[PDB]
């Protein structure tokens with residue numbers, strides 16, 4: 636999930652938008 | 657400038673991006 | 678809502694807790 | 699102390715209230 | 720006090736330093 | 741640079757002023 | 762606990778602290 | 792833009808930045 | 822609520838959240 | 852992305868997120 | 882150093898930075 | 912004052928604190 640995608644691994648701001656409502 | 661604009665009005669990440677090195 | 682309430686008025690951690698998953 | 703209780707180990711918000719005045 | 724002064728007016732790091740233990 | 745001076749190693753607030761404009 | 766006055770990102774910080782591993786949903790008006 | 796590690800409160804700060812008014816969910820269990 | 826690791830500035834943010842007007846001490850030497 | 856209303860240190864946080872390893876310059880008026 | 886305008890949690894951040902391992906006391910009015 | 916590790920967003924927060932109106936550059940590549 637987000638923690639894996641963005642903390643454990645590395646993510647872009649674009650990817651972070653995946654978790655917007 | 658951007659510092660004032662973001663605070664007194666709004667600004668976009670795209671505008672912010674201009675301030676990257 | 679809670680976002681507006683916390684900012685325009687006050688809110689408690691207990692109210693915030695309702696927004697946990 | 700707090701760093702041991704809350705950073706090194708793990709603490710609740712309740713425990714953090716131990717350090718309120 | 721310092722909490723109010725920093726927010727309603729301005730304060731310096733030197734003034735803040737008085738609040739270190 | 742700053743990351744080496746202040747994150748990797750340790751720096752004072754005074755040293756951080758090195759990176760002011 | 763004390764009542765909170767939390768705007769912008771400070772609300773999200775507070776939710777983060779309060780919810781921990783449960784996570785949370787941030788749903789502003791409009 | 793860039794890709795960085797964004798963890799904990801920094802992750803939800805980033806979500807807040809990115810999502811803003813849309814709102815977001817932070818669901819570390821997944 | 823929850824238990825997390827709260828360190829450094831995140832710890833004093835949490836103290837601020839929790840204590841607010843009461844005030845707090847942050848005394849890492851103990 | 853959404854438009855931002857960012858004052859003080861929140862602007863610097865946003866720049867940090869946006870610029871990543873490129874870094875950035877923070878240049879307020881006056 | 883420059884003078885500071887610091888409200889809420891930003892004051893606590895500043896105290897954190899300024900005091901380091903010495904820690905600090907946060908004592909608002911009332 | 913003190914010397915601490917200041918990394919990532921905490922470093923640019925510190926720069927903001929220290930530099931304020933002067934402005935600053937954050938240039939991690941160096």
Ligand SMILES: [Cl-]
Pocket residue numbers: none
């Ligand atoms: Cl961290």
Ligand SMILES: [Cl-]
Pocket residue numbers: none
């Ligand atoms: Cl603010």
Ligand SMILES: [Zn+2]
Pocket residue numbers: 771861891
């Ligand atoms: Zn703020």
Ligand SMILES: [Zn+2]
Pocket residue numbers: 801831921
């Ligand atoms: Zn952090």
